[PDB]
Structure formats: C-alpha cells, structure tokens
Amino acid sequence: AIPWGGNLEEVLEELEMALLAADVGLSATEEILQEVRASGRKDLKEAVKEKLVGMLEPDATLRKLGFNPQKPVEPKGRVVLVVGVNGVGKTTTIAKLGRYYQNLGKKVMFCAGDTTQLSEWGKRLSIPVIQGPEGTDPAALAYDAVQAMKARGYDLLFVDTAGRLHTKHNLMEELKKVKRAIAKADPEEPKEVWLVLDAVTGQLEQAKKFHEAVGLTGVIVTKLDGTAKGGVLIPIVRTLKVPIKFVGVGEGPDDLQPFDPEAFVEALLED
Template sequence: MIDTLWEWLIVAGAVLAVVVGLGVAFLRPGRGAPERQLPTPPKPEPSGDEGGGGVLAPPRPTPTPTPTVPSTPTAPPVEEDVFVEDVLDTPVLDRPDTAVGRLQRLRARLARSNTALGKGLLNLLTRGGLDETVWEEVEDTLISADLGIEASTELVEALRTQVKVAGTRDEASVRGWLRQDLLRLVDPRMDRAIASSRIGDRPAVVLVVGVNGTGKTTTVGKLARVLVSEDKDVLLGAADTFRAAAADQLETWGARVGVPTVRSARDGADPAAVAFDAVKAGIENEVDVVLLDTAGRLHNKTNLMDELGKIKRVVEKQSPIDEVLLVLDATTGQNGLRQAEVFAQVVGITGIVLTKLDGTAKGGIVVAVQRKLGVPVKLVGLGEGPDDLAPFDPEQFVDAIVA
C-alpha cells in the first residue's frame, strides 16, 4: 500500500508541474494572449494663457526660420540733451509772406474789383459832348464808389477845369488827370507805419477795436503774421472774453507763427484785466509789440463803449497805448463812418484797417474815412487767406483803379 501511495504522489506531482508550466507560458508577454495596456489621455495644446481660462486656443503655427544676416558693427550712440518728446512736439511754423508779395496781390486784386470804377469814369470822360449831364454821371459814379459827396464834387471840378484848359479828351490825358487827382485825395503824405518797435524799455502796444462781424480777431492774427515777417517779436492778448471761441481762434493764429497768447482761464473774465496781464507779460518778456484783441461792439451801445474805454485806461496804468486800430468792413460804405466817429471819440483812433476791400468796387471809402477822421488807412484786407492783409500803399491803390 505504501508503494501504491508513493506512486500516486509521484503522478500527482508530475501533473501539477505540467499545469504550472502551461500557466506561466500563457501569461508571459508576446506569447499567448496579448499584453493589456491602459488608454493614454489626449495631451492638450498650450493655450498661451498661463492663467488658464478654460478655453483652449487654436494650435500655433510653426514659425519659419529666418536666415541670420551678420550685423555691421556701429559706433555707440552719442549722448545728447535732447528728449524725443521735445523733438516730436516741436510745431512746424508757417513762413508768412513778405510785404512785397502782399503788395503785388493788393494791386492785382484791386485792379479786378475796381475795374468798374476806373472804366466807368474813363468811358464818361473820353466820349464826346461833355455837357452837364455827363459831368453829373461822373459825380454819381464817384459817389456810388463811396468817395463821399464832398470829395466827389471836388474831383469833378478839378477834372472839368483840366479838360477845359487842355482842350482835349484823349484817354491817356484823362487817365493821367484822374490818377493825379485821386492820389491827391488819398493823400500819400500820411504816415501809415504801424507802431511795432520797442520804445525805451517797453514794447509798443496796439489796441484793435471795431464792431461785430468786421473780422477783427482774424485781422489781429493776420497782423501778427505781417509783423513776424518783419522779424518782430510779437505777443497777443485775447481781451475778447465775451465770445467763447475768440481766445481759441487768436491762439491758433499765433501758434502757426510761433507767437504766444495771453488769455483768461475762463470765459467772461474782465477784458481789462486780460489786456493788463498781456502788456505786463510783454514788458517782462521784452517783446517788440503787444497786439490786444477786443470784443466787437456796436457803436450805439453805451455800456459796451464804456467797457472799451475802461480797457484803455487800465492798460495805460502801466504802459501808454501807441496805436489804436479801427477795423472797418469796406462793404458797409458810408454806414461805417458813423461807427468810426464814435470809436474815435471813446478811444482815439490812430489808424484804419479796411477789410473785404477786394470784394467791392467801392474803394472810395478809403478817401471818405480818412477825411472824416483825419487818420490814415494803414492796412487793407484782400481776402480770406492767412497772408491777405497788406500795408496800404496809396499809389498802388490809385494805379489799380485807373489801370
């Protein structure tokens, strides 16, 4: 029995060995059943936002490599006391036209606008039969050109005498007589210079006045350009505190040619105080001339004219006013003469600026206003351009009429 049991154990051990061997062979990789692998989760693309907003950005394209170019060695930059901001903020200033160019345009434009006056007179004077009717037509033509009744009558009488004495009416002779008599009425002997140079230790002070709508602020800006073209150091005073845009407008005119403007920080400030501060700044900065712009006002408004008188008195507490320029619209003709009289009484006019003279054939207003006030026309406005303000030249003016 022992032998039988022993044999059974040997057989059982052999069977067990075979079974274990088969199991190991079955579980080894590459043999039998394939090895199991866990699924790998997808790898997210970088979003470019380290904060992580939860939204993935689209994949970035692969950059194309750029060929390397060997750089040329340069000298180290020179250190200078120049700031980039200063270079970028430096304004490009206008270069105003000279007086010569302005006078050329004056003659050309006056010749176009006053052709009717000159041709009309020549046609009347050179045709046959200079009877009383013709002479009345000549006088009417002069009056319609705003020469004024007194000056028109005087000119007609002078022409009648010359025609009678010479006994001729050819165009060349009549043109010469007409030029001579008109030039005498315009009076080239009047001083038409603008006060624009320092007087002792102070600048010249110019006060600019006028009624509404004559182009006063624009005239001040253009006058600044005239003086800058003559190498004058100019300062502007924005004493028109009534009209909101007046100070801005004047400041813009000045900035274009590098001229500073003294203005109030608020609208409706006392114009006399602004004018005072402007003159004070002009004295401290040793400029050549201070131009003071004032608000337009009707000559029949007593309170506004009193305000203008106050401006003049306040300024004169620290400096005399050397020039008071009255800006007149040439198209208003004889209506402007009453305005001129009232302004002359309040502030004492020293010179006239005639604007819009290029748009009218009524050039006779030059003679009329000079006779009325006894002061010269010093500047004339020729148009809307920035340099369309010119010194008044009597001979150029007359030649433009009779040319």
C-alpha cells in the same frame, strides 16, 4: 477809360463816372470835381491823383514842412489797440497782422481782450496770446499783456477788444478802461488805436463813436475782395480823418496788404 488830353469838360464827365462807378460816392466825387476845375493845371491826371492821394493821407509840423522826410506801415509804438463792432474781421485781422509782422522779423504777442478764435490763431502762428478764464476783466488782462510784452522783450502787442454794441455795459467805457490800463503798464502806450471796418458795410456813424472814446490812429478795411468797389476807402478817410493802414483781401492769414495810397489811386483810374 478817361480821356486825358481832351476838353476840360470831357475829362470831368468821364472822371465823375469812373469815381462814381468805383463807389467813391457822390460827396467826395463832387469835391474832387470842384477842386480840379479851380486848380488851373494842364496836367489833370496828375492833378486828380494829387487830390485823391491828398484825401487818403490826412496826417501840423508836416503842414509847415510840406513833405514827410521819413517817406512802409508800422506801428508807432509797441501796443496796438484794435477796435470795431463784431463780425467785421477783427480777430482774423489781428491774426493776419501777427503773421505779417512776424514775417518781418518782429516778436509779436496777442491779448485776447474780447472776453476762442484768437487763442487758436496764436497756436497756429506760434504767437503767444494773453488770455484769461471765462469773463476776466479785459482791462486787467491788457495790463498783464503789456507787462508780459515788456518783460519778454516783444516788439508788438495786438489787443483784441469786445465789439458788442447794445449790452448791459457801455462798449465805449470798456474801451477807455482798456486804454487807461495799457497806459499804467507803459504810459507812452497804446501808440496805435486801429478801427477795423467792413468794405461791403462801407456805411461810419459807429466808427466816429469809436474815435470819440479812444482816439483812432488808423483804419483797416476788410473784405475788399467783395462786391464793394475799392473807391469806398475815400469816404472812409474823409469821414474818419485817419489813414488806411491795411486792406483785407481774403480769409487766409496772408490776405492782408499794407495800404499804398499811390498804387490805389493809379489803379482807381486805370483803363
């Protein structure tokens, strides 16, 4: 419980505790504390919320404007390239993404570009999966998938990718190839490139490599039902500078929640 209304120095000491306990981490926490003193506002809970919300929402034209007139997570286009290292919940996350968007009325397709599990999810969810024979070129596959999505009038295509980091072929170059192939099928695409990260392993070095290669537009952080306190989302967005799109909160297909930075911040600071 943080004493809003107590002495300036009392609020900050219990804020540091709350934030540190939440796994927001020393670097971000110190930043908030610095930011908060500076800003000589009487309403420090509202001031704290603004700084925490602020650092989760890194998305020029909006800077000039000062608000977003359109503000409900939805891909900006039809194709979402999903990237990440193996074992983070990439396949499962795609399955949950399909479920979530098909529950909203979208026609969703999957592309099995990790050349098993995805095909089976597609059957279960009644979602078509573009898939190929044992080791097919994932890039040629992604191109066929975008053409199939266009031709059959589908709204969303989720492209699964390899996540093995020290193989004979460079993972990042394979990704750029998939991304180039998608753009030959539809040059506006992929409008989303989404990194999947483990909460528990809330550790970002590799994550930056993903961004340099293919240009992230968002992150999905899985396993927020785990021992990692939810405050780890803060250093994730500070470091990556793309918003959290969804949070994974269990192993079943409905355990995916669109991220709400305002609800998150309110819950972070709750008594």
